[PDB]
Write a protein that binds this ligand. Structure first.
Ligand SMILES: Nc1ncnc2c1ncn2[C@@H]1O[C@H](COP(=O)(O)OP(=O)(O)OP(=O)(O)OP(=O)(O)OP(=O)(O)OC[C@H]2O[C@@H](n3cnc4c(N)ncnc43)[C@H](O)[C@@H]2O)[C@@H](O)[C@H]1O
Ligand SMILES: [Ca+2]
Ligand SMILES: [Ca+2]
Ligand SMILES: [Ca+2]
Ligand SMILES: [Mg+2]
Ligand SMILES: [Zn+2]
Length: 217
């Protein structure tokens, strides 16, 4: 089960991906999560990425494709994987095609979680993340049991630094402008599977499951 999860900032990629990886047993490979782990470790990858991420810009294609090429070479991708937030540009998608050909791990489908731009500020500004495990909540749409604390581990919730309104606007503009060529790319391959992301979390997931049940062993 070799999958890409794509969608605009805030569309619910992490929310759905967490469910997918628990139910279907494939690794969750989020480039945003990778860059943030690098930044927390203060590695050289993290320092290079940080300049772009803090401004809401895309990290350049070449280093992004490099981190993904190396990640997809691990033994845990041999029966399937869930890329989340990559590819984000058509050049990334072209590069991934070639990587996956050499690796013998061709994509089955690209799931596109479709959500109107106008709804995404409110998703991102109300988002609260667990400092311990990185699971996401929303103050209105998906609140924790105990305000300000993760259900799983009692960790303090925070706001991601790029979830401020200015940076969210830049992220939306930047990502909208890259999205259409990417959708065109995958629609021409036939791999693109669109899901309505403006439903209850469990209803988006039910639609995801309708596709993935046809791909499991
Ligand atoms: N390939 C690449 N190339 C170049 N640069 C790259 C790159 N990948 C990363 N980068 C760099 O890294 C940065 C960060 O990338 P990344 O971390 O991937 O950020 P992104 O694509 O902006 O997406 P988010 O993680 O913000 O949102 P999500 O879709 O996962 O939504 P979530 O499930 O949390 O949900 C959002 C909120 O809504 C809530 N929610 C979820 N589902 C629903 C629902 N159905 N209804 C109501 N609320 C919901 C959640 O509880 C949560 O509060 C980029 O800006 C860029 O600089
Ligand atoms: Ca290897
Ligand atoms: Ca329902
Ligand atoms: Ca429905
Ligand atoms: Mg995410
Ligand atoms: Zn937690």
């Amino acid at each position: 089960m070799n999958l890409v999860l794509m969608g605009l900032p805030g569309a619910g990629k992490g929310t759905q991906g967490e469910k997918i990886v628990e139910d279907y047993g494939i690794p969750h490979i989020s480039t945003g999560d990778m860059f943030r782990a690098a930044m927390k470790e203060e590695t050289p990858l993290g320092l290079e990425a940080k300049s772009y991420i803090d401004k809401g810009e895309l990290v350049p294609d070449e280093v992004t494709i490099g981190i993904v090429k190396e990640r997809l070479g691990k033994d845990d991708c041999e029966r399937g994987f869930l890329l989340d937030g990559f590819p984000r540009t058509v050049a990334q998608a072209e590069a991934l095609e070639e990587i996956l050909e050499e690796y013998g791990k061709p994509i089955d489908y690209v799931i596109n979680i479709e959500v109107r731009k106008d709804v995404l500020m409110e998703r991102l500004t109300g988002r609260r993340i667990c400092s311990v495990c990185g699971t996401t909540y929303h103050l209105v749409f998906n609140p924790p049991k105990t305000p300000g604390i993760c259900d799983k581990d009692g960790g303090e919730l925070y706001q991601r630094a790029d979830d401020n309104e200015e940076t969210v606007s830049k992220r939306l503009e930047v990502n909208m402008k890259q999205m259409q060529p990417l959708l065109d790319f995958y629609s021409e391959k036939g791999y693109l599977a669109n899901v309505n992301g403006e439903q209850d979390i469990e209803d988006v997931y039910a639609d995801v499951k309708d596709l993935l049940g046809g791909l499991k062993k």
